[PDB]
Design a protein around this ligand. Structure first.
Ligand SMILES: Nc1ncnc2c1ncn2[C@@H]1O[C@H](COP(=O)(O)OP(=O)(O)O)[C@@H](O)[C@H]1O
Lengths: 370, 278, 269
């Protein structure tokens, strides 16, 4: 349809959305469901009460915020639809589904059921005439312009190493783990549970995630930096409540490298990435060594990629030239590529029309996805 | 002193059990071992023939380009291999893939054209599903039954990539309108070897029973049955990767302990950490 | 000699590993002059003798085997029980008993049963110790296995800074005899083998047993996972390569769109 195509940056922790041509997603607000916490009494108390955005961040202590995209998979389907209606609202889209073309993005190793249910929304509730569910890693490759690259997302409940080849990854050499900063920050709070901080609300935990994004990093030396005694730098709450930090800031992200801290049946996302690369040809592995792409948001720690480099040096063989690209809109890299592909008018064949859904449902998407 | 006849039997056995593609290389290794080419070739000639027969060697005569799999229903006994797909019998060097002089075969026809239609649909499918190695439907009107012997095979040999995969799918069928039975196997021989040998072998003994109405009518139907068993079993194996990956693995060797946290032998040896009450 | 040795080792890599003992027997019957060379290269699979005086079914290796007399890691009873032979230090004898008990617990931590025996034989600047763990298959199911953990640590203690160089030999075998209908008569044997160095501190809190046990935990999980991901996803790709499920001419148009993607990449870059 002759309208600007909608780009949906399906961020796990921070979801985003926008259009073609643009470089930053037009409308940004994370992935969450903020349900209320009290009962209206005074005339002036708003209604609907499952608010998102300004009211959410504004009244954090008044909204029982929950998260649908658990393990990178939405559980509050209907609520996410309404969050899209929130996007469809005067705030973000001010339009209809039937008007603009839409582009959905995806992570690797996704169950078909989610894609099918999404298509049900897209063509039954929402009625987009030009839409297809794409990937996310190849979109970050569009952003980088690279061809034979390994894309590593960094969200809240998803972590995947995608060894791509010219924008067409081996759909087998890709690895995917559905865990990141959500439980890592929860585990950091668990460190503070030992030292008395079990401030259980998710909005109360959103502040902890603000510390995660703010006062956290990755110390390259594991025990040499962990076993020693820190200085315990202080943090101040929205009111300014003094809370020390300590070693936790780098202790908790070790879970991503040592899943034994939570007992996850993973083996360190770094080794999983090494294995994702190792599921290809040696020369293809060299091409992937030359092109290492990072995505998501958790790629913003001190010594993050540095400790990763050290791990690869201690695990991968010799001559592995770890050429890691470190851009800034790693979250938006997928959005950037979505805007790039959205600018590509070849999408006519790549999309799924409304009648295409009427005749195939999501089977057309499964026949066209890669 | 050990009798060389034991080595003949052991050699023929191991050469029939040789990895796919590395068969001649296995023969070379055994030749480097015994180095008695006479006694070697005694059991090895049958190992060559039998390996081509069970392994379904897709010999392709250049003048016909059939890619006929070698089985027991093709040879004339004197290395001349009949072709159910094009009614020709060609001599074949069992020691190699070398074939020669395809002599035409005046055969049945009451089943040959029928399997040609079946093999046409199967070839159209299989070529869209296989890359190195394809199908060959043998035919025989034995015991008053137009016995369809649908032999299918696939492989790819990448020793550079250190693996020699091999697939075989022999299907047993009898054109007896209407009561017919779609019997079949789905033989696999995966041979990866670098840093840990992966000699994966499996199959799928299946027996269906389709109704024979006509040649082209039930041809694609029989091929569809084979097709679905292939798709289903490959799907089952794909799921088996995950189910074994966690179930079989942790069942034999756990991934994490029962507590899944960490094993500190210091505290374990300290105080005899739990043999007191537990 | 060397030609038969090399062809024998690569042949064992080529031969069906379900008959490794019998294949090696056939190999000795073929060339008995290279018997011990092949025995040294490909060691014996895990055999189990019983320490009757201690009540310990113990694994059989080369080091406990005093000549041809398998030492028990609990009572030092050879098999046949000789008087002198495979003897570690007295402190190492007790430390070996401790390690054997703790590693039987380790075997219970990952196998919940089986037979495991670690053999030690002292030396000055550290020593060498063979670590063995054996477990049967899923007798309750159709899948069968023969767990053969063959490990040898290169204990190299450094008096300076109480660290100790280690290089645990890795070698693990097991069967994947899944005879399920969805799997067919599926069997697989991962005849695995690795090794990697490390210098670990030996202390009252981190002794040799604890050090090596941690490394065992690490190495086993790493190799196991490496197999499960690399090797099994690789075999999955092999499965898809030999037989594709998707019919072609469907993927052709998708590849045409892929070509258009590369075209667009050139349109902008
Ligand atoms: N500056 C930062 N430092 C560390 N982590 C961050 C930072 N910014 C965002 N993150 C993490 O990235 C997550 C954003 O999720 P997102 O990356 O959008 O999911 P996806 O990987 O699906 O795009 C947040 O939950 C947060 O934990």
């Amino acid at each position: 349809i002759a309208n600007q195509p909608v780009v949906i940056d399906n961020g796990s922790g921070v979801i985003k959305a926008g259009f073609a041509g643009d470089q930053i997603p037009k409308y940004c607000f994370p992935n969450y469901v903020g349900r209320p916490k009290h009962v209206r009494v005074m005339a002036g108390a708003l209604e609907g009460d499952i608010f998102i955005g300004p009211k959410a961040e504004e009244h954090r202590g008044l909204l029982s915020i929950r998260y649908p995209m658990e393990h990178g998979i939405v559980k509050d389907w209907n609520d996410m639809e309404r969050i899209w209606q929130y996007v469809y609202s005067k705030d973000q889209l001010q339009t209809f589904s039937e008007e603009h073309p839409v582009l959905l993005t995806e992570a690797p190793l996704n169950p078909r059921k989610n894609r099918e249910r999404a298509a049900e929304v897209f063509f039954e509730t929402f009625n987009v005439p030009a839409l297809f569910i794409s990937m996310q890693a190849v979109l970050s490759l569009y952003a980088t312009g690279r061809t034979t690259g390994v894309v590593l997302d960094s969200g809240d409940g998803v972590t995947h190493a995608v060894p791509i080849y010219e924008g067409f990854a081996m759909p087998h050499s890709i690895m995917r783990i559905d865990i990141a900063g959500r439980d890592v920050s929860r585990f950091l709070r668990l460190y503070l549970r030992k030292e008395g901080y079990d401030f259980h609300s998710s909005s109360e935990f959103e502040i902890v995630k603000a510390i995660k994004e703010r006062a956290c990093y990755l110390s390259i030396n594991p025990q040499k930096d962990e076993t020693l005694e820190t200085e315990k730098a202080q943090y101040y709450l929205p009111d300014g409540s003094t809370i020390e930090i300590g070693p936790s800031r780098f202790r908790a992200p070790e879970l991503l490298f040592r899943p034994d801290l939570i007992g996850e049946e993973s083996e360190g996302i770094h080794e999983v990435l090494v294995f994702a690369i190792q599921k290809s040809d040696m020369d293809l592995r060299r091409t992937l060594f030359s092109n290492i792409v990072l995505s998501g948001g958790s790629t913003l720690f001190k010594g993050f990629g540095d400790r990763l480099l050290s791990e690869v040096k201690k695990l991968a063989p010799k001559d592995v030239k770890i050429r890691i690209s470190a851009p800034q809109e790693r979250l938006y890299s997928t959005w950037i590529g979505g805007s790039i592909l959205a600018s590509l008018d070849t999408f006519k064949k790549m999309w799924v029309s409304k009648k295409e859904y009427e005749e195939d449902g999501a089977r057309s998407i499964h026949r066209k996805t890669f | 002193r050990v009798s060389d006849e034991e080595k003949v039997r052991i050699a023929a056995k191991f050469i029939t059990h040789a990895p796919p593609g590395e068969f001649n290389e296995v023969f070379n290794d055994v030749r480097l071992l015994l180095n008695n080419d006479n006694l070697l070739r005694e059991g090895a000639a049958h190992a060559f023939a039998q390996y081509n027969m069970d392994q379904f060697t897709p010999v392709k005569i250049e003048g016909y380009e059939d890619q006929v799999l070698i089985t027991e229903h093709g040879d004339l006994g004197n290395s001349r291999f009949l072709d159910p797909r094009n009614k020709i019998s060609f001599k074949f060097d069992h020691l190699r893939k070398e074939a020669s002089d395809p002599q035409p075969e005046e055969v049945d026809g009451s089943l040959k054209s029928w399997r040609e239609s079946c093999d046409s649909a199967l070839r159209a499918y299989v070529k869209d599903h296989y890359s190195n190695g394809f199908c060959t439907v043998y035919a025989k009107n034995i015991d008053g039954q137009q016995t369809i012997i649908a032999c299918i095979e696939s492989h790819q040999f990448q020793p550079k990539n250190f693996w020699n995969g091999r697939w075989r799918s022999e299907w047993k069928f009898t054109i007896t309108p209407p009561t017919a039975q779609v019997v079949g196997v789905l033989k696999i021989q995966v041979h990866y070897y670098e840093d840990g040998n992966v000699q994966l072998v499996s199959h799928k003994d299946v027996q269906d029973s389709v109704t024979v109405s006509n040649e082209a009518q039930t041809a694609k139907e029989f091929i569809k049955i084979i097709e679905h068993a292939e798709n289903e079993y490959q799907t089952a194996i794909s799921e088996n990767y995950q189910t074994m990956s966690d179930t079989t693995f942790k069942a034999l060797r756990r991934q994490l302990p029962v507590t899944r946290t960490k094993i500190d032998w210091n505290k374990i040896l300290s105080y005899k950490i739990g043999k007191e009450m537990q | 000699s060397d030609q038969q040795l090399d062809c024998a080792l690569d042949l064992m890599r080529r031969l069906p590993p379900q008959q490794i003992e019998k294949n090696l027997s056939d190999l000795i019957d073929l060339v008995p002059s290279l018997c011990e060379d092949l025995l040294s290269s490909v060691d014996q699979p895990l055999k189990i003798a019983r320490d009757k005086v201690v009540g310990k079914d113990y694994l059989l290796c080369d080091y406990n085997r005093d000549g041809d007399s398998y030492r028990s890691p609990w009572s030092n009873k050879y098999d046949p029980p000789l008087e002198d032979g495979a003897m570690p230090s007295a402190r190492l004898r007790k430390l070996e008993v401790e390690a054997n008990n703790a590693f039987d617990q380790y075997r219970d931590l990952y196998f919940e049963g089986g037979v495991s025996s670690v053999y030690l034989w002292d030396l000055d600047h550290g020593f060498a110790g063979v670590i063995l763990i054996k477990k049967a298959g899923d007798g309750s199911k159709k899948i069968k296995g023969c767990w053969d953990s063959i490990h040898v640590v290169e204990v190299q203690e450094k008096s300076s800074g109480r660290t100790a160089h280690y290089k645990l030999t890795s070698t693990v075998m097991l069967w994947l005899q899944t005879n399920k209908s969805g799997s067919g008569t599926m069997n697989l044997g991962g005849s695995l083998t690795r090794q990697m160095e490390k210098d670990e501190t030996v202390s009252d809190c981190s002794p040799h047993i604890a050090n090596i046990g941690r490394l065992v935990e690490d190495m086993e999980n790493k190799i196991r996972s490496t197999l499960n991901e690399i090797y099994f996803g690789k075999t999955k790709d092999i499965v898809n390569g030999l037989r594709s499920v998707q019919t072609f001419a469907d993927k052709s148009k998708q590849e045409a769109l892929k070509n258009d993607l590369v075209e667009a990449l050139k349109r902008k870059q």
